[PDB]
Amino acid sequence: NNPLSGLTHKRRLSALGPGGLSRERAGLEVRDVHPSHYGRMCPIETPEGPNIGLIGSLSVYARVNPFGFIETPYRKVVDGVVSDEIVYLTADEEDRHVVAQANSPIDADGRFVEPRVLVRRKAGEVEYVPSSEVDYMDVSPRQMVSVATAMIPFLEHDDANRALMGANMQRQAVPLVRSEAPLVGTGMELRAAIDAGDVVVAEESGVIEEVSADYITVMHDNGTRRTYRMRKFARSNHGTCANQCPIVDAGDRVEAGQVIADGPCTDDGEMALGKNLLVAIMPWEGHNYEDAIILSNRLVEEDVLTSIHIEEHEIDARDTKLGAEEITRDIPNISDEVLADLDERGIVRIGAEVRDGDILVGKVTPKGREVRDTSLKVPHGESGKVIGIRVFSREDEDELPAGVNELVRVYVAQKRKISDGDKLAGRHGNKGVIGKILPVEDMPFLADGTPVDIILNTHGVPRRMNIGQILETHLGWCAHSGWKVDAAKGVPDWAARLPDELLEAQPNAIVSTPVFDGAQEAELQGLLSCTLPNRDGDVLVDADGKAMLFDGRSGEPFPYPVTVGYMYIMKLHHLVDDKIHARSTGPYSMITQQPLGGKAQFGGQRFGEMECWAMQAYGAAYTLQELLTIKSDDTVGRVKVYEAIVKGENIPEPGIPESFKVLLKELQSLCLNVEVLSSDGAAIELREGEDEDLERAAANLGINLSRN
């Protein structure tokens, strides 16, 4: 789906397989968190279906023994002074010592400031001991989290389930056409993109000679030349688009390890999976009821959330007993207005717009000049632009399969915009479906006339215990607007622990809040009150993080201030264009005559047992009978119902289903004598019945389509 999902697929530990547990045999003690997982397996990132607890992810600092046991690094403290020698310890060796914490008050010389320190003992218990027997120390915080979890700012303010959902949802984001970097993030987005491998990295130092959109040539210091090629519009395993774009000039000097070209979800070398949007937190007329989201129309006009999606189609020409098949534009007796985009060989032309039910490759097979017609048509609901064709032919020295003479692959691309029903999410467990798209002129706007981009409801925040989103909103507003703390007389007490180069910022700055050591609430409250004004000398957001808004439909100002800021929103790969389905009549199965299943083929919806219970409790006896016989198995009543609906007459009576007859045949085949009796014995034969089933309509009820 994106670089993060691929990098997370590896570094993944599975408890199943040939020699491991099962999905119902496994109980409740193997799918739990153990005190010995600290620094080896992440306690947050795991599936939430029937695989919960049986799949995990390796931690950031862990490695594997030659024997196969996981190790984690510790920093040795001897005689009360913390050294810099690092020792890799397994669980067996770890449960013999006392291990201190990474946030201990070191006195800039190795000595603990406080005698009593917090340690981890053998049985997973935490106790206070004097600084005389402590012998190891954690190498850092975030040592116990994985690489997907270490990219959530303000993690310690979120509950465990919301953090789990956010970490799992970060890997379903689709690659956008622009991919700008976050305003407030962690320090993990730089190294998670280089190691993923979806960016181009210079291998030797040198001077760039010439740059284009297809290649880069770098001249080394010894006169050797090396050129790099870029992948343009390549299809991924899941149907997304992978692109690489150079980010260097024609005279720049590069070094070994410098990022030279970008990737799918990369911005200047850093991972970027979403966009920064202006957020207002308030209810609005019931359009954001129960996790729904209201969106602006500017996000559609300017293609803020747009994605390219490619699809591949294949066909083959195989040898038939009655003669081989061939590819040409000689479709037996068909109009010439449908064969206008096909070239000489009989394949569509590049740059052509295709709809649903259009010829892609023309092929004919000898039937029983025996010429039938079997051509590659575009599946239902699809449409795009043909972007590439690949042809492999036996004659032209090609290692084809056995009994094949030609294989063609056609690629079709589309540009999908954001619309109602698409799924959006943030990094803190927020998720919802677009309920409405509003015009720009009827959205709430600030005092200067700036409309908001997205409205979120306030009823879902407090009961779910994910308040890191509001903190991120406050810090995002502070970073976007810029700040400068007034330090004419000394330094304010709240800014004593702030580093330098954090006392003054410019608009559109980028900051980094690590996972467990970041911005405390005191510094956020301080920064919210020293913010640079806009183009005019006005301050829109007061010290509490709230702004006064106007109403875009009536014009009156809202009576109370509302929380405004900037948030990072991602587009998830659950789109409404790939979820809608409907059917009136189509293909049927062979043993039982019920409709097929699935969306790939026209398939029906299962009416299971519980729905039968509901319809029996309602008292509806005719609806149930019609659902279970005419619409599913009554092979004779289906065509009669179709003809009665078409001609406008009454719906006839149902008959008998086929599953009952199949059951009777199987029971007989088990050496059991089953028979249907009447009021006076005389077993009913149950044998078909001579029918005048002549088709006086001639229009395939549905099992097929229609040709002229």
């Binding site: 950031v60 600092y61 690094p73 920093r75 810099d84 690092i86 990474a102 946030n103 190498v139 850092s140 915080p141 970097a181 993030g185 320090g187 730089l190 190294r191 280089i194 590069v254 070094e255 070994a256 390890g257 410098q258 990022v259 200047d268 070398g269 850093e270 622990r497 580093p499 180069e501 954090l502 910022a505 700055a509 980028i510 900051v511 980094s512 809040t513 690590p514 050591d517 970041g518 911005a519 510094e523």
Partner: peptide, 21 residues
């Protein structure tokens, strides 16, 4: 840091990292 051409992203951290990922 440690990357030749990384963008400048100021940090709020208060501790020091003795080890590299």
């Amino acid at each position: 840091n440690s990357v030749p051409g990384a963008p400048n992203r100021v940090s709020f951290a208060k501790l020091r990292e003795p080890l590299e990922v």
